[PDB]
Symmetry: C4
Subunit: 478 residues, 4 copies
Amino acid sequence: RGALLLDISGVIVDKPDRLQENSLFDIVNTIRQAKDDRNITGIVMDLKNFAGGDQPSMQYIGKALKEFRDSGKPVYAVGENYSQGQYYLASFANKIWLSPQGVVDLHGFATNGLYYKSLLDKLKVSTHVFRVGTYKSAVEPFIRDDMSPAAREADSRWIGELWQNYLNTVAANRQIPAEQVFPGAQGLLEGLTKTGGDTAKYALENKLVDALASSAEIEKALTKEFGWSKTDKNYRAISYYDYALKTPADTGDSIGVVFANGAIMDGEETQGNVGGDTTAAQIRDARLDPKVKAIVLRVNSPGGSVTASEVIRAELAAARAAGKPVVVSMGGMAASGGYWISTPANYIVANPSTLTGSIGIFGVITTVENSLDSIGVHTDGVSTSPLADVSITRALPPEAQLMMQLSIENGYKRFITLVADARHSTPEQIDKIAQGHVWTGQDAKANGLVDSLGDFDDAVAKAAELAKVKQWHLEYYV
Amino acid sequence: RGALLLDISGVIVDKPLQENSLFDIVNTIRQAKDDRNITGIVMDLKNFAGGDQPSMQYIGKALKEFRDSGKPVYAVGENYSQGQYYLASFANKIWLSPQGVVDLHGFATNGLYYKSLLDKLKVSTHVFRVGTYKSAVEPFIRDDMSPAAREADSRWIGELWQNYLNTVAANRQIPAEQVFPGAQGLLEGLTKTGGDTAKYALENKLVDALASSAEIEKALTKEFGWSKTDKNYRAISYYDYALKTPADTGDSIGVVFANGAIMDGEETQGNVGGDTTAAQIRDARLDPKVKAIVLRVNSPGGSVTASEVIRAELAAARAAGKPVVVSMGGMAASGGYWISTPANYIVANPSTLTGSIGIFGVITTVENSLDSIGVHTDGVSTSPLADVSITRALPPEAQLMMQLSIENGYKRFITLVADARHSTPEQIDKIAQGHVWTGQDAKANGLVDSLGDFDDAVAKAAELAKVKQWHLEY
Amino acid sequence: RGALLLDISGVIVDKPDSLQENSLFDIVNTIRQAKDDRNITGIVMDLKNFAGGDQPSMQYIGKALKEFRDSGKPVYAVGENYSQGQYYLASFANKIWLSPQGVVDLHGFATNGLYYKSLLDKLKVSTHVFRVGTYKSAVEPFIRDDMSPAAREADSRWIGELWQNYLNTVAANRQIPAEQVFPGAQGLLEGLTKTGGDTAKYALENKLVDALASSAEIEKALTKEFGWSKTDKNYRAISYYDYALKTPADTGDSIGVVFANGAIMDGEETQGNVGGDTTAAQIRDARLDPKVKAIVLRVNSPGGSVTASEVIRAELAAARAAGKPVVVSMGGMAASGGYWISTPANYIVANPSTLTGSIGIFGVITTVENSLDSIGVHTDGVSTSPLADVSITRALPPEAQLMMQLSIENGYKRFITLVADARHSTPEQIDKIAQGHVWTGQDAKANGLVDSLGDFDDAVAKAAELAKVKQWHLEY
Amino acid sequence: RGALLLDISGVIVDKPDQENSLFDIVNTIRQAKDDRNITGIVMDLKNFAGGDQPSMQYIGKALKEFRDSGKPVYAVGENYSQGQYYLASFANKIWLSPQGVVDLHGFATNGLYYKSLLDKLKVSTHVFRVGTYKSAVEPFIRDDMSPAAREADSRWIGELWQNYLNTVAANRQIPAEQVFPGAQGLLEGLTKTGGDTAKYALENKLVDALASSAEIEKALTKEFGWSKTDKNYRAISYYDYALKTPADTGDSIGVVFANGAIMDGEETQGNVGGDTTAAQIRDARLDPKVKAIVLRVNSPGGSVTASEVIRAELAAARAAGKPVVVSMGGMAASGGYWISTPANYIVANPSTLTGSIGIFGVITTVENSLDSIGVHTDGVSTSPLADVSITRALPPEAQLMMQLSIENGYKRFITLVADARHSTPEQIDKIAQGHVWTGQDAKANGLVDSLGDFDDAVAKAAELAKVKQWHLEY
C-alpha cells in the first residue's frame, strides 16, 4: 500500500515525438487505475519539473483527479513554488502545500509576435500575399509593423476567454471567487504590500494554498497519512514512472484512434509533424480492419499543407462511407487545416478552451531582385513562358500573380463548401463565420462548427453509441 | 499475377530510392511486357522529382512498347508536375483528383550575373576567351545576358519546349497548343471553369478521369483484382520486382558511362574521373570478348586535361579496331563533346544539348579589395611569371601567357573536331565559337551522325562488328 | 624504494567532474601516506604542466608537504621555469632547482571585468537592474563603463590581503623578507637591469631559488639522492599517478563529506555545477544513515540560484535538528548563495584567503525593443495582464518592474534575516556587513560570519568533536 | 621482372605524420639499383605536389647512382609542373605529350602586411626585436618590405632559383639560360612556334621526345616487356615494391627528427615537441649501443624555451661521449639553428635556408578597439605587472622588462653560436641580426661546416664514432 506520486517531469502531449514528453492518455488512465487499485491509498502531486500542457489537456487530467477524490482517496499537492501551469493542475488537489518563502505565480495570458514590414522595405525585399480571410492574420508580419485591428479583436476574444476559463476552473477548484484567484495587477501589488512582499502569506490569506510548510514538515504530514518505508527511507509511495499501467483486455469490437498531432505536411511523418500519407494509411488500416467498428480522430493541429489535409479528409470520408462512424476529438488546437481534416466526421467534440475554426487560406511569395540589385547582383535568363520565371531571385511576373490569386480564391471556396456540406449549412452562412476567424470551442459550438463541448471520453462514448456496447481501443502509434 | 507498380521515387540518372537508373527502369518495363505475371502497369509518380527530357522519352518508348503488346498502362495522382505529366502522358488512361492540377508552365533558364558586385568589391577580373557564344563567362563581365547569348539560349530552350509539347500532344492526341495555350490561354480557360484546374484538365483532355483515391482503388481492383493478403489491388512495386540477370553469351559490348562534370583525378563525389574512365575503356579495349564500345555520355564537360586522357583511350580502342559508339543522353557539351570526338558514330536525342565547342579561363585577384581594408602584400620574385596568386595583381607577362594558352586550347578543340567530323578548322569555327546546339541542330551541322537513343547506339555498335551480344558494364 | 614524483598535470579542484582536474584530497592524502611508507624516501615536484589551484587549496597541499618534510624526508623542486602558482607549491620544498636561463615569474594579483554601458546604449538595449547591495558589484557591467568607487574599495581590500597572504607564506618558506620575494614592479625592474635581463641570476641572488642546472645535471643530483633504476633508465621514482592511495580502514561511525563545488543551479547536477536536488539528496542519505555521526559540507561556490540554495540549506538545517552536527569547510570561494547554504551549520571554518560573504541580491533584465525598432522589427500581441507581457523583445511593463523590485527587497530581507538568526545577531547588525560586500575568511572571522580560520582537517576534527570517537569518511 | 614505377603521389617529407618519406624513396631506389628483378625506372609524377629543393636533389642523387649502374630511368608525363620537372630532369629520357607544357616560371615569395588594418581597428602593437633582418615581424609593423628584408630575400631566392637552373641545366646538358630564358625569351620562343608549348620544349631540349600516351606505352613495353597478367608493361609501383628491413649489426647511429615548428609541449600536429625530441635524444644518450647521433633538421624555428630543452639534451649526448652531427634539409633557421649549435659537425645543402640568428616577440592589445565600440575593462591589481590580459594596455613596466628580456635572448644566441662556431660575439653579430642564409652562404661564413646531404651527415657521424653501423630511429 502506498501513494501514487505524480512527479511529472516535462510536458504533456497527445502522442510522443522522468521523460520530457508525457502522454495525456497514459497519465489519465494511470490515475483511473490508481482509483480502483486497493494498493494505492492516495495521490501526491510534485510538479516542480512539469513544464505544462494546453488548457484542454490539463482540464482532462483534472477530471481524472476529481474522479479520484470522489472515491475518497486524498490528492495532495506539494512544492516550494507554483508556476501558473503547475498551479492549474495542483488546484484539483484536496490540499495544497506551499513553502513559507514560495510564490503562486499567476500573471495572465499573452500572445506575442514579430512584425517585419519595415525591415523588408529596408532590405528591399518584394512581398506578395495571396489570401482570403480578413482575420487570417498569420500573414500580417510581412505586411504590417503591428497587428491589424481585425487581428486584435479576434485574438482578444479568444485569449480573454481562455483566461476566464483558467480563473473559473481554478476558482471552482478552490471555492473562492475568480477575482480572488487573480485580482489583476493593482490588487496583486496591494495584497503583496500588506504582507510586506511575502508571496506565501498572500497565497495563504487568499486561499490559494491550504498550508505553508517547510519540506520536512511536509514529509512528516505525508508519512503520517501514508506511512514510512524502511527500504526507500521515505513515506510509502511509488512514482508515476514506475507504476505499471495494466494493458487493457481486448474485446473484438474496437474503436480505432488516429492522431493528428502537429503541423500537417505532405509526405511521410517527419520531425514532430503530421504526414498526410502516414495518417491516411493509418485511417485506411482501420477502414479495412473488420474488427475496428468506429474511428476517433484525435486532432491537435494548427494546420499546414492543403494537399496533405485533402488526402487525410478523403480517407476519413471513405471510412464513414464504408459504414464506420468517424468522431473527431479536438484537444487544444484543431484549426485551419486541422479543421479541414475534421469536416467529414459524424460528430465533432471540442473543449471550451480549444482553438478552432480559422477557416481561411493564405500564401506568401517574397522575392529579392531589388535586394540583390542594390549590391550589384542580377539574374538573367530565357524562358518559354512567364509562368516559368518563378524563383526567389526574380520579380514575380503578373501572369503568375493572376494564377496565384485565382488559386487562392478557388481554395477558399473549396474550404467553405466542404464545411458548408459537412455542417448542414450554406457556403454563404459559412462565409459569415469563416474569413480566417479563429474561434474557441465555446464559440464554435455556438456557431455550428462543432457539435458538443467535451473531452476524449465524450468522443469515444459517441463513437461507441454509433454501433455497440463493449469496446477496446486500437491505437496506431506504430 | 498483378500490375507492375511504377512508384518511382527520386530522380532518373544514367548511373547511380533517390537515384534511379534509367536502364534498370527501361529493362524492367521491357521484361514486364513479356512476363505473363504482369498484367499491366500503374504509374504513381508523386515522389518522382524529374529526369532530363531524353531520358524520359526513353522510358516513354518502353511504355509505348508495353502498351503495343496489349497490356494496360495507367497514371494515377492527386496532382501532376510538369515532369510527372510528361511521363504519365505515355499512359493509356490518366486519372486526376477532382481538386488536382496538371502544372504546365514551360521551361526557363536562370543565372547570377555579378559585374557590379565585383566592381563594388574592387576585385580585378581577368578573362581569357575564345567564343562569342561561350557565355558561361558572362556572369563575371556582364550584369545581364549578352544579346548573342540570349539568341543562342532562346533557340535551344525554344526547341526543347516544343519537343515537350509535341510529344505530349502526340501522346494525348490533341493539338500542341491545347496541351499548353500560353499564359493568357491558360488564364482564360481557368476563369471559364471557376478556377477549377482539374475541370480544366478534363475538358482539355490532359487527363481522362476525375476521381478520388478510393474511386481509383476500386477501378484498379476491378482491373487487377483484390489481394486478401495485402488488402489492396494486385501489384508488385518496381523496387521489389526482380529484373532477371541476363545470360553471358560470350561476345560482349562494353558500356562505359561519362556521367557528370569531368575531373582530373579519379571518380570523386558525383563526378567523372579522367583516370577511372580511361581505365574502364582500357579494360574494354583489351578484353578480347568485348567486340565494341558504347560511351554513354551525360556531361557539361570540365577538365580539358582529363578530357584528353579519356579521348586518347577511346581513340586507342578504335585504332585497335573496336568500334566506339557514343550515346548522348541529356548533355554532352564542351568536354562532354571533346571525349565524344573519336567515335565511329555519334547518336543524340533531338532534345540533347551538345556542342559548346569553345574555351575559357577566369582569374580574379583581390589586391585592391585587400588594400582598401589596409592589408597589403609584398615579396621578391625571380620572374614576374612567378608572381601569380589571388592576393597579387596579375602581371602583364602572366596575362600574355594565359591569353596564348587559351588561343591554343581553342585551336586544339576545333582541330580535333575538324579531323573527327570530316571538316576543315575554318568550317568548324563557323559553328563552334561556344554556341550550344540541341541534338537536332547538331545532326544538321555534322557534329552528330543520327538522332535516336541508347537502343540505336547499341544497334550501331553490334552492327559495326557482328550479330549476337550482351552488355558489359564497368 | 623511490622518490614520490609529484608531476601534477592540470588544475587542483575539490571534486573532479568524471590529468586536468586533480583532487585536492587525493593529493594531500597521498603525500601523508607517502610520509609513513618506507618505500618513499623523498618527494620531487615537477610542476611544468601544473595549471594552478586556488590559494586555500595550495596552502593545504603545502601543509602536507611541511608534514612530509618535518618527518625528515627531503622535498625537492625542479623546473626550467616557475609560473606564479607553480612557485607557491615549489616554495614548500627543501631545495629548488631552476634552469640556468629560466624565470621565477612573480607579478602580483589582478582582477579584470568587462563593462558595457556605452555598448548597450549604442545598441539601444533597455537595462533594468533590481539590486540591494552597495558592494553587490556584479551588476556594474550593465550600468557603468568602469568600477564604482565602492567596488574599487572592497575589491582592493581582499585582493591586497590575498597577495600579502601569498607573499607572507612564500617569504616564510624561503626564510627571507616578503619584500625580497617580490620588491614591487620597480624593484623587479631594478634587480633585472643589474643583471642584464637575466632572470635566473636575479632569482638565485635573491634566494627565490637554490641552484641553477640543466635537466641533465638535476638528473645526476637526483639519482645521487634517490639511486638509479637500471630497469627504468632513470633515478628511482614513481609518479603520483601510478602510486596507489590506500582506501582507509572501515570503522562504522562515519563522518559524511558532501561537496558544494561550483555555481548553484536549480536542477540536478549535470555540468561543472552544483545541483540543488542532487546535493539535497546526498545530505538526506547522510541524515538518515544511522552510521553517519556528523556532516561536513565542503564548500567552493560563487553562488547562484536562491531557490536551489534554499533546498540545500533546508536539508542541512534538518540534519542538525535531527541531532547530527553540520560543519562547513569553506575552500576557495563561499559567497552569496555559497554563504546561504553554509548558514545552518554548528560551525563555520574558512581559510584566511577564502572569499566569502557577499550577502546581497541582484537582478538584471535587458530588453531589445528599441534595438529591433531601429532595424524595422516590432512586436505586438494581446494580453490579459501587463504581468503576462514579459519577454526579451518587449518593453518591461511598469507593473512588472514594481513586482521585481518588491521581490528583490524581500529577497534581501530573507538573506540578512537567515544570517542574523544563524550568527546570533540582529537583522540591523548584519546589514552593516552585508550590502553585497565580499570578505576574506579573516575579515569574515572578525565580523562573526565565520567561526575559525583553518582548513579541511580542522572542520573534520570539529565535526568528530561535536559527536565522538574514531571516524572515517563517507563521500557522496 | 620490370621497371620500378615511381608513381609518387603527394609530397616529400622527412618523416610522415599524401606524405612520402624522403628516405624510403632514396633507400628504395638504392635497393632497386642492385636488385636484378628491376630492369629500370619509370617516373610518373602526375600526382606529385613537390618537396623542397634539397630533398628532390637527394632523390636525384640516387637516380644518378641508379643510372650509372646502367639501368635506364624514364620520365613520362602529359605535362610538367616546375617541381615535377626538376625531378624528371634526372631521367635518361623525358617524354612529353604533343599537347603538353613544361611549366617553368621561377620562384616567388609573398606575404601579407597588416599594419594599416591594425591601425584601422585601433589595435595596440608591441614589437620586441633584435635583428635588422628579422623580417617575420614586418607584417605587424608596416605596409611593405623594408629595404633590409628585400635585400636578404632577393639574395636567397635568387640563389635558390639559380641552383634550380644550374642543376637542371647540368641534367639536360644545355646552358642554364636555355632552360628558362626569362619572360621575354620564353614568350618569343613560344611565338617562333605558334603558341605550341611541346614544340618549344622539344626544340630547346627540355624534353627528348613528344609522344602520344599509346606511343609511350609501346616504347615502354619492348624496353620492359609486356605482362599478359597485368596487361601493361612489366612494372611494379613504388608503393608495392617492398623496401627490405636492414640488419641489426651491433653498432647503431641514432637518427632524431626535428621536423616543423618547435613548440613547448609534447609533439603535436606537424610540429616539434621540445619535450618529445629531448626524450628521443635522451634515449639515444643512454642506450649504450648508440655511438653517434644524427639530428635531421627541417624547421623554421619557433619557441626559444623549447629550443633550449633540445639543445641541452644534445649537448649532453655529446659530453657523454656520443658525437652529434646535424643534417639540415630545407630549413634550419632561428631555433632550428639554435638546436643545431651543439653538434660536432653541421652539414647543409647549398639550397638549405638557415641562419636567421635573431629574436623577436609581439604583443597586441585591444583596449582602444573595445573603447570605440563602448566596451571597457576595469579592476584592481596589486602590481602593474599583473594587468597583462589582451584587453588591457601593456603597462610601461612590462614594456621595459620585455625589451630587456629580448636583448638578453639575443646575447644568449650570438653567444651560443660564438662558442659553437669557434668565433666571437662581435664576429657572429656581423652575420646574425636575423639574416637568412642559404646553405652556401652559411658554409662561407662559418655557420655550417660542409655542403652535402644526409649521407654525408651519417658518414661523418660514423667517422667521429667508428666502424659498421645501422640506423636506429624514433
